[PDB]
Amino acid sequence: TATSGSCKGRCFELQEVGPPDCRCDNLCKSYSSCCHDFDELCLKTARGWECTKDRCGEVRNEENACHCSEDCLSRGDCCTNYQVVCKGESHWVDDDCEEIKVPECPAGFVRPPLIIFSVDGFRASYMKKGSKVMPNIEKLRSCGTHAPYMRPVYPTKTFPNLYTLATGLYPESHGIVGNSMYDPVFDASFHLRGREKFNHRWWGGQPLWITATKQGVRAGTFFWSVSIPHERRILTILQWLSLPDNERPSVYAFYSEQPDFSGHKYGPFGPEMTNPLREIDKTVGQLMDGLKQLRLHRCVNVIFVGDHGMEDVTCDRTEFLSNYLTNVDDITLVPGTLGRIRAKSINNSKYDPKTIIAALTCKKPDQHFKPYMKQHLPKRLHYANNRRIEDIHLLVDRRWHVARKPLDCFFQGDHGFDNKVNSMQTVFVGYGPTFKYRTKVPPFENIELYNVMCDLLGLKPAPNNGTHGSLNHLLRTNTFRPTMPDEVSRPNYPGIMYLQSEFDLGCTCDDKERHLLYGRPAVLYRTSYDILYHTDFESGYSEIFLMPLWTSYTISKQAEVSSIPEHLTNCVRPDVRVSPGFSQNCLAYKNDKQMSYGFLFPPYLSSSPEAKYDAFLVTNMVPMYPAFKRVWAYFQRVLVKKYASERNGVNVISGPIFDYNYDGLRDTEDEIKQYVEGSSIPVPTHYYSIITSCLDFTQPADKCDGPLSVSSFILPHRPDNDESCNSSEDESKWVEELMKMHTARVRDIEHLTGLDFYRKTSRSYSEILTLKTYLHTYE
Ligand SMILES: CC(C)CCC[C@@H](C)[C@H]1CC[C@H]2[C@@H]3[C@H](O)C=C4C[C@@H](O)CC[C@]4(C)[C@H]3CC[C@]12C
Ligand SMILES: O=c1cc(-c2cn(Cc3ccccc3)c3ccccc23)oc2cc(O)cc(O)c12
Ligand SMILES: *[C@@H]1O[C@H](CO)[C@@H](O[C@@H]2O[C@H](CO)[C@@H](O)[C@H](O)[C@H]2NC(C)=O)[C@H](O)[C@H]1NC(C)=O
Ligand SMILES: [Ca+2]
Ligand SMILES: [Zn+2]
Ligand SMILES: [Zn+2]
Numbered sequence: 187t188a189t190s191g192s193c194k195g196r197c198f199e200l201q202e203v204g205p206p207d208c209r210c211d212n213l214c215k216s217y218s219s220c221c222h223d224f225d226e227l228c229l230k231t232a233r234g235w236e237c238t239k240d241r242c243g244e245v246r247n248e249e250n251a252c253h254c255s256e257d258c259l260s261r262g263d264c265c266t267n268y269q270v271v272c273k274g275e276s277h278w279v280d281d282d283c284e285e286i287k288v289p290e291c292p293a294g295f296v297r298p299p300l301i302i303f304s305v306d307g308f309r310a311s312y313m314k315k316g317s318k319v320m321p322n323i324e325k326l327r328s329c330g331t332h333a334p335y336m337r338p339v340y341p342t343k344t345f346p347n348l349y350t351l352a353t354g355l356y357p358e359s360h361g362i363v364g365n366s367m368y369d370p371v372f373d374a375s376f377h378l379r380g381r382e383k384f385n386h387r388w389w390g391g392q393p394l395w396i397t398a399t400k401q402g403v404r405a406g407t408f409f410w411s412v413s414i415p416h417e418r419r420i421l422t423i424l425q426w427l428s429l430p431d432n433e434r435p436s437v438y439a440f441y442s443e444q445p446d447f448s449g450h451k452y453g454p455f456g457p458e459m460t461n462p463l464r465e466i467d468k469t470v471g472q473l474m475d476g477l478k479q480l481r482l483h484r485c486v487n488v489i490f491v492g493d494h495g496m497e498d499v500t501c502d503r504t505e506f507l508s509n510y511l512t513n514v515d516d517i518t519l520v521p522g523t524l525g526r527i528r529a530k531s532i533n534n535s536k537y538d539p540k541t542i543i544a545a546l547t548c549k550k551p552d553q554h555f556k557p558y559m560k561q562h563l564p565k566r567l568h569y570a571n572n573r574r575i576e577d578i579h580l581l582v583d584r585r586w587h588v589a590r591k592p593l594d595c596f597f598q599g600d601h602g603f604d605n606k607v608n609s610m611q612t613v614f615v616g617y618g619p620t621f622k623y624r625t626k627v628p629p630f631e632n633i634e635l636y637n638v639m640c641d642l643l644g645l646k647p648a649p650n651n652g653t654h655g656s657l658n659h660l661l662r663t664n665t666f667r668p669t670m671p672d673e674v675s676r677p678n679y680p681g682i683m684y685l686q687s688e689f690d691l692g693c694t695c696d697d698k699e700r701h702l703l704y705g706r707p708a709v710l711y712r713t714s715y716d717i718l719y720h721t722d723f724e725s726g727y728s729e730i731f732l733m734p735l736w737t738s739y740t741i742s743k744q745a746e747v748s749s750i751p752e753h754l755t756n757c758v759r760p761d762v763r764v765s766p767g768f769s770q771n772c773l774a775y776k777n778d779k780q781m782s783y784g785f786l787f788p789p790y791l792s793s794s795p796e797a798k799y800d801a802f803l804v805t806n807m808v809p810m811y812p813a814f815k816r817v818w819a820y821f822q823r824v825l826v827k828k829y830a831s832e833r834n835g836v837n838v839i840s841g842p843i844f845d846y847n848y849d850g851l852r853d854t855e856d857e858i859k860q861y862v863e864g865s866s867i868p869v870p871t872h873y874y875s876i877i878t879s880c881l882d883f884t885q886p887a888d889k890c891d892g893p894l895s896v897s898s899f900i901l902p903h904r905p906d907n908d909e910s911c912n913s914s915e916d917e918s919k920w921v922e923e924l925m926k927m928h929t930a931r932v933r934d935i936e937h938l939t940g941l942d943f944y945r946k947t948s949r950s951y952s953e954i955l956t957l958k959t960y961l962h963t964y965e
Contacts, residue, residue, distance in 0.1 A: 213409060229418070242271065283624070299435070303473065309445075309492075348493055359572075406426050416442055492612030524603070566928070697754075723737055731844075745791060784810040821901075893957075931960060
């Protein structure tokens with residue numbers, strides 16, 4: 187509420203309160219207000235950002251952007267090359283890499299500071315496509331810890347990903363579900379430009395800077411008004427690092443608009459990309475040079491991280507909704523590399539998403555987007571449980587845009603696509619005493635980083651979507667020790683408790699260690715279920731849901747596929763181990779015109795004709811739409827054998843998922859919205875499978891003594907195959923493409939089932955946590 191105090195040295199100061207008296211911050215330009223004689227004493231430019239010999243020993247001239255005077259080291263406002271030019275020191279990039287075993291911090295530093303150097307639109311492959319031009323970045327990468335790439339969250343846009351980095355949450359949970367959003371409860375829109383985004387109401391979860399503050403760790407200001415030149419951002423961090431140790435922050439963030447901006451103008455692989463990459467490396471070098479002359483280069487942990495990649499996208503490759511819909515003026519479209527559609531609602535509830543989606547489904551052979559109800563999007567995207575996400579979503583093909591009409595090249599790159607697309611992958615490098623030395627780590631998802639940044643600062647993370655401990659292998663020391671959750675429900679192991687004569691199911695037939703390689707899955711909620719053993723498979727059968735929670739079986743490389751004898755096609759047999767009242771019945775299915783059934787262990791993989799009869803037990807049967815059985819039957823008859831054949835055997839765990847409220851979490855019985863007609867048999871929203879083998883494929887899956895290899899999926903249990911535009915073709919032409927789109931992490935299935943897998947292995951639990959967060963992308 188005041189525009190004219192004199193920020194007594196408060197330039198870029200980390201201590202503020204409300205109004206009046208203007209604030210002294212690098213965000214003042216964004217609020218169009220600081221003690222604006224806190225301004226141009228603070229934003230100088232004179233004489234550039236590098237000392238020259240003739241400047242060495244100058245008397246401090248307050249007009250210079252940085253200083254080469256004898257009092258500058260005190261304040262940290264020397265040019266970062268000051269000691270190299272004036273004191274005979276070398277550039278940090280010219281020094282050999284020396285392992286940092288303990289933090290070497292100067293007087294007054296209680297903990298190693300963390301600096302996050304974030305770069306917008308830094309595609310992972312840039313780490314090579316311009317490698318000879320990034321000496322500082324490549325040193326950090328080769329001498330610290332790096333992954334080949336880090337996976338962003340969907341949508342692969344800046345604000346959803348920066349806030350995921352900050353909170354460890356999926357966008358649906360932290361609230362920043364796009365760069366642009368409409369919230370029906372606020373009845374307001376959020377935009378990259380403008381002031382609406384500054385209202386705290388938009389931002390959920392608990393970001394790193396608030397986590398630190400709440401726990402007594404001071405945070406620098408992570409955000410920079412775009413007018414502040416990148417060199418000044420570095421010099422300000424360095425000046426803050428020079429504050430006394432009761433004002434000095436322990437965690438800092440630098441941000442650069444590059445290489446995103448040049449990626450947009452020229453595309454990710456234009457020759458024009460080299461200059462921005464050179465400039466970014468120069469800035470990294472200024473930072474490392476600045477840390478060295480403050481004797482902090484072996485004390486600070488540095489993270490170099492991007493928010494997303496960049497793809498080739500041109501105005502020529504635009505789909506227009508007006509080519510599909512006759513009434514595009516009754517709808518609002520969030521356009522581009524993704525689509526979100528809602529009604530314009532001034533005179534319109536003829537708006538029905540069901541018709542719009544049907545009108546956007548496989549209408550042109552080479553159609554470059556696919557419509558979805560948000561709950562039918564691949565579950566790995568975790569993009570549905572937020573009122574800011576429109577019911578209608580368009581997943582846009584990489585390299586394409588979607589727009590409303592041809593009225594909506596200047597740009598050649600864009601991003602925002604499906605986060606498993608390789609062009610969207612970005613970078614992670616960690617460098618410092620707490621990160622490992624010269625260590626490469628597998629790719630990981632950016633939702634994991636908040637836990638690590640917390641660990642790096644001694645903070646307890648707020649609850650988030652990372653898996654705490656899955657990244658412990660990045661860290662030399664003070665990791666957090668994860669422990670496996672305790673099993674909640676104990677199984678029963680029923681024997682023969684009833685005889686075939688007590689069953690009134692309406693079912694007929696023509697019937698008159700090996701399979702649990704990683705230990706029994708633990709059930710982490712309260713329920714009643716039975717362990718059922720068979721020659722070919724083992725299952726945990728829920729007496730609540732009348733169907734297995736999981737079915738586990740091992741299929742050797744040499745396994746033979748057999749068909750279902752004609753006399754057995756309709757066969758369903760009572761299971762004398764399970765009460766008829768906790769059993770499904772076959773009349774429910776004959777009475778449900780829309781529902782058929784399938785089996786979790788496939789009769790096609792039975793080991794003998796004797797054992798095949800086991801596969802037809804009522805305890806192995808699950809409700810399946812006929813459309814979905816086309817998918818499931820192909821998977822069980824064809825794909826499982828294929829996977830066994832390619833991977834030297836596989837262990838498979840399959841089962842149902844119920845997520846009618848699309849929150850990514852296992853439904854309670856109350857939340858289940860669909861049952862087989864006139865029955866208590868719930869209808870799954872999805873069916874999962876987890877396919878495990880030995881990473882050393884020279885060992886059979888049942889004889890593995892090292893790291894495991896997993897691929898998993900969560901297939902939508904849908905009554906049609908409209909998602910698959912080629913489903914009228916033979917299944918060999920579309921089912922595997924469907925499954926690859928719905929690939930999943932084991933962790934995703936854990937949340938959706940309440941089960942805990944891999945509880946009995948020869949691996950460390952941290953190593954297992956890495957396995958559970960793996961995603962097989964097929965990219
Ligand atoms: C003008 C643009 C270049 C920069 C825009 C910066 C803006 C997105 C940032 C700056 C101030 C931030 C909020 C502030 O840190 C307080 C918190 C508390 C935390 O609990 C939730 C997030 C929130 C609201 C920050 C969100 C992002 C803000 C608005
Ligand atoms: O000043 C700006 C700062 C930022 C970001 C800062 N960090 C650092 C960080 C470190 C740990 C956890 C969360 C965040 C980012 C990371 C990823 C993406 C963006 C940023 O993004 C901007 C985007 C704009 O469009 C305009 C801006 O001025 C900024
Ligand atoms: C992602 O993480 C958030 C935060 O832990 C989870 O949301 C929490 O969900 C529980 C269970 O519904 C609620 O009681 C809390 O209100 C939510 N937030 C917090 C801070 O506890 C969310 O379920 C996670 N998503 C997935 C898919 O696991
Ligand atoms: Ca649910
Ligand atoms: Zn970005
Ligand atoms: Zn961008």
